[PDB]
From Swiss-Prot:
Zinc fingers (C4-type), renumbered ranges: 248-276, 744-770
Protein name stated in the entry: UvrABC system protein A
Protein keywords: ATP-binding, Cytoplasm, DNA damage, DNA excision, DNA repair, DNA-binding, Excision nuclease, Metal-binding, Nucleotide-binding, Repeat, SOS response, Zinc, Zinc-finger
One Pfam family linked to the record: UvrA_inter
Species in which this protein is naturally found: Mycobacterium tuberculosis (strain CDC 1551 / Oshkosh)
An example Gene Ontology CC term for this record: cytoplasm
Keyword Glycosyltransferase: no
Any one Gene Ontology BP term: nucleotide-excision repair
Binding locations of ATP: 31-38, 645-652
Source lineage: Bacteria, Bacillati, Actinomycetota, Actinomycetes, Mycobacteriales
A GO term, aspect molecular function: ATP binding
Domain ABC transporter span(s) in chain numbering: 306-592, 612-941
Gene name for this UniProt entry: uvrA
Alphabetical list of SUPFAM superfamilies matching this protein: P-loop containing nucleoside triphosphate hydrolases
């Protein structure tokens, strides 16, 4: 058999399914959400693919593996080692960038280290080396009275164990050795791990720059230069480093010893920018809080940290308190008196101000304030003053910004001076990294370069240069041309992240692999779709075999074989509805998929659309943030708006970092940092903002649908207030798995335990003591309508909904969860196991569980995610419902149906990153399909 075969897969609601798949095909898994698609694809097939292979690695890791919950199948075979390509992790670590993620940056450092020449930062003369003598002369010329410790870094972070070395240093007695930070009396050194890299510097002298101490000055400096390989580092008291091999000709100091490849890593201290330490950024309070038009009243407030009841009454007073005392009152707009504004911001006059207050009873007749409560110090103060979430709440008046020293570049300047001489500029590695598009970098690295990669360096760095462009190549291929090497890894969308992984994997040149991909058409424009299907195929064609969980027409159309997964949701699914070619699937009358796919079903374009109100329009003005080009954009209120456009066009920066962040500030009063812009129009036409993020519901198995929606409180009471419970004296609290009495003590009531996996990813294994119940057995003695807590927590929501039809206080929450489509989800199903869409959808069911006051605004970022056709159809009703109450709903989408249904679309582009951040078209679908310049328009037009 050239076949992948599975018998009796039972992993979740999977009903002992058997499959006979064509290896060396692009297989696509398909069906309604919560069909079991993923349990089969990822939890069983892949999971086993990986496992069986890894078991080989070492007979040891074979044990470390033993402690996994091997997926529940009976027999599988024709199984290639598997590799997952989902969109699960968007790690927030600051230092890590595309460059780093793709290892491309790594190669860059080798390329720079070993070809292309360094320069001094100021004088700039090609950089020479330097004789111990004129290193003694530099230091002799120093400031008299300066005191510094001649220090010699014999070991610059290399690894070893240095017992022999410590002796040779007690051999001429030092007693002052710093290793790995901590200082050790060189009589008594520490034992070192030969395995860990190390940092051993001996103090050679504590000195001072007297004229005629020249003898010890000269006599120490030569010794350190000798003992630590020509490196002295004098570390002052009133540090500066000197290298034998790297020197400004004209005697400027250079703050970096070797030009070694690490010296480029803004992760190593050696290259990293000293100020921000290669973080690139500094959190730094903007003068931005404000609104220039409003000023100082309670109804008219100016200075944002100072707008309340007691806080507001208190500071307004003190402003005008100095405001006839500097002549600016409390009734001029912020953009009004230049002298006046610099006051509340800086320290200004610093003249005691008259503060009048009513005493504890009424007494009054006291007090001043030693200070104009200097505003930018209210900040430093209160960030310090109250330890809390509040601290981040105050942080909301600061803005990450590039570091002035390192220019944002996260780099020690001397490094920035190293230079690859190709065409217009021998741009720094960072100049190359910060290049606008992958193509921008590829062009210089790929062409502008080899053709002046000199005959010495072609021999020593030529291969490296090749390895780089190959890699840039594949990036273009996955259509990532538009981002830059230097972009932060965390910022990239799940799609973008995934699209990268695909570039890495496709390049890997691996054959015989089973790649299991999770919905890669996500966050990808309809345009780039047929492009990606190619890269997918060429991945198969290389000699691999794919399984793609998907609901996209084109991808499915293009599949070699299709498994359609049990019809219905949860219990109702988990069976192989279809498994065969595309045509054959169309024939299948039981495929909900086939229905839509054949045409028996569709989502129909509303014959009468919602009409837009010009007078009632929410408007972002002058959006400057990232690639947005100071645009003005108006979203019509009380209607369905899709923001569309290709990946990288600013869809997110607009709607999320600016449009949403403002509304959260102006309607729900979070103190959250909106992306740089001018302002937002009207806005008082709205009660509140609902941002249905796709972020996880919770990071712990503590968070549950029962918890999150808060139905569990209402159930814990239904339980405590029961015949069996009261006879035992059980309060509502015991039924809370969060709370010391009644929850199992081994899991602390989570039900499962996160067992660290080392090379493989960490995974939850059900607790042995509990079996994953959450509760100790005595607590489970208690029933309600013949079901314990664990049982009722285990119910599908759809199931629990019928079960609680009686208590309509609880039934409300459950109906909306069923309405939102999550019927199939288990009431107390650990939050970490929810798909970003499910999580999104749960949050959505929380606001549905509220009074729909006809002027609230909903922001749905890719709500289409992880949904089947039919699922979309259901969801759209939920949305029109919402909008028919006259609520405003704004949606970022690539999905055609959703777009073709919207009443208004805003199309950003034209391209991604640098090209883009403009409005390519806006109007009704009909209008936009009309704009020939619009990509969204192109596709939209085939449907309109
Ligand atoms: Zn210089
Ligand atoms: Zn910096
Ligand atoms: Zn337990």
């Amino acid at each position: 058999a050239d076949r992948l075969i599975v018998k009796g897969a039972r992993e979740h609601n999977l009903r002992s399914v058997d499959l006979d798949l064509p290896r060396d095909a692009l297989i696509v898994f398909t069906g309604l959400s919560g069909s079991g698609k993923s349990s089969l694809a990822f939890d069983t097939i892949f999971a086993e693919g990986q496992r069986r292979y890894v078991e080989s690695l070492s007979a040891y890791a074979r044990q470390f593996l033993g402690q996994m919950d091997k997926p529940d199948v009976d027999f599988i075979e024709g199984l290639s080692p598997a590799v997952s390509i989902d969109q699960k992790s968007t790690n927030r670590n600051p230092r890590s960038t595309v460059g780093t993620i793709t290892e491309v940056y790594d190669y860059l450092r080798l390329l720079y280290a070993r070809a292309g020449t360094p320069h001094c930062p100021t004088c700039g003369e090609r950089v020479a080396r330097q004789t111990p003598q004129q290193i003694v002369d530099q230091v002799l010329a120093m400031p008299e009275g300066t005191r510094f410790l001649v220090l010699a870094p014999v070991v610059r972070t290399r690894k070893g164990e240095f017992a022999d070395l410590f002796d040779k240093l007690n051999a001429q007695g030092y007693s002052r050795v710093r290793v790995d930070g901590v200082v050790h009396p060189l009589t008594d050194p520490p034992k070192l791990k030969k395995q860990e890299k190390h940092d051993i510097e001996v103090v050679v002298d504590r000195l001072t720059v007297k004229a005629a101490a020249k003898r010890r000055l000269t006599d120490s400096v030569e010794t350190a230069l000798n003992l630590a390989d020509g490196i002295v580092v004098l570390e002052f008291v009133d540090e500066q480093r000197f290298s034998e091999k790297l020197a400004c000709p004209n005697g400027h100091a250079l703050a970096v010893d070797d030009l070694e490849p690490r010296s480029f890593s803004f992760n190593s201290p050696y290259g990293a920018c000293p100020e921000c330490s290669g973080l690139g950024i500094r959190k730094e309070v903007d003068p931005e809080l404000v609104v220039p038009d409003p000023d100082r009243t309670l109804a008219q407030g100016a200075v944002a940290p100072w707008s309340n009841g007691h806080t507001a009454e208190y500071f307004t007073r003190m402003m005008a308190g100095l405001g006839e005392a500097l002549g600016f009152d409390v009734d001029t707009p912020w953009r009004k008196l230049p002298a006046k504004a610099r006051k509340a911001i800086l320290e200004g006059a610093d003249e005691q101000v008259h503060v009048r207050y009513r005493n504890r009873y009424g007494r009054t007749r006291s007090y001043y304030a030693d200070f104009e409560g200097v505003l930018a110090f209210l900040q430093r103060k209160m960030s310090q003053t109250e330890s809390e979430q509040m601290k981040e709440r105050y942080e909301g008046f600061m803005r990450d910004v590039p570091c002035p020293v390192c220019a944002g570049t996260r780099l020690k300047p001397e490094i920035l001076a190293v230079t690859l001489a190709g065409e217009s500029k021998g741009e720094h590695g960072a100049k190359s990294i910060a290049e606008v598009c992958e193509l921008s970098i590829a062009d210089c690295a790929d062409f502008l370069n080899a053709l002046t990669l000199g005959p010495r360096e072609q021999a020593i760095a030529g291969q490296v240069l090749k390895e780089i462009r190959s890699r840039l190549g594949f990036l273009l291929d996955v259509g990532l041309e538009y981002l830059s090497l230097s972009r932060a890894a965390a910022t990239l969308s799940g799609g973008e992240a995934q699209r990268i992984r695909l570039a890495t994997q496709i390049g890997s040149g691996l054959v015989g692999v089973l790649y299991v991909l999770d919905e890669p058409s996500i966050g990808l424009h309809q345009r780039d779709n047929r492009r990606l299907i190619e890269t997918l195929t060429r991945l198969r064609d290389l000699g691999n075999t794919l399984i793609v969980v998907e609901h996209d027409e084109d991808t499915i159309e293009h599949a070699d074989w299709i498994v359609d997964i049990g019809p219905g949701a949860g219990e109702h699914g988990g069976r192989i509805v279809h498994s065969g070619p595309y045509d054959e699937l169309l024939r299948n009358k039981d495929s909900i998929t086939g229905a839509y796919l054949s045409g028996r079903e569709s989502i129909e374009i509303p014959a009468i659309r919602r009409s837009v109100d010009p007078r009632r329009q929410l408007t972002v003005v002058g959006a400057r943030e990232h690639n947005l080009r100071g645009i003005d954009v108006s979203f019509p209120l009380g209607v369905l708006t899709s923001v569309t456009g290709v990946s990288g066009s600013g869809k997110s920066t607009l709607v999320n970092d600016i449009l949403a962040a403002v509304l959260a500030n102006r309607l729900n009063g979070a103190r959250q940092v909106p992306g740089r812009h001018t302002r937002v129009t009207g806005l008082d036409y709205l009660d509140k903002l609902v941002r249905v993020d796709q972020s996880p519901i919770g990071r712990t198995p503590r968070s549950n649908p029962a918890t999150y929606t808060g139905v569990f409180d209402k159930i814990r009471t239904l339980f405590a207030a029961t015949t069996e419970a009261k006879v035992r004296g059980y309060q509502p609290g015991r039924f809370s798995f969060n709370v010391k009495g009644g929850r199992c003590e081994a899991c602390t009531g989570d039900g499962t335990i996160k067992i660290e996996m080392n090379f493989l990813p960490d995974v939850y294994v059900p607790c042995e003591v509990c079996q994953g119940a959450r509760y100790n057995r005595e607590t489970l003695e208690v029933h309600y309508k013949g079901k314990t807590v664990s049982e009722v927590l285990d119910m599908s929501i759809e199931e629990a909904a019928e079960f609680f039809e009686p208590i309509a206080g609880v039934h409300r929450y459950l109906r909306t969860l069923v309405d939102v489509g999550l019927g199939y989800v288990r009431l107390g199903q650990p939050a970490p196991t929810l798909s970003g869409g499910e999580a999104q959808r749960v949050k959505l069911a929380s606001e549905l569980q509220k009074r729909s006051t006809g002027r609230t605004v909903y922001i749905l970022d890719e709500p289409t995610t992880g949904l089947h056709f039919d699922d979309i159809r259901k969801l759209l009703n939920v949305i029109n419902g919402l909008v028919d109450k006259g609520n405003t709903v704004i949606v970022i989408e690539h999905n055609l149906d959703v777009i073709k249904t919207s009443d208004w679309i805003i199309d950003l582009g034209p391209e991604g990153g640098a090209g883009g951040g403009t409005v390519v078209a806006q109007g009704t679908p009909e209008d936009v399909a009309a704009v020939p310049a619009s990509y969204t328009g192109k596709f939209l037009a085939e449907v309109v």
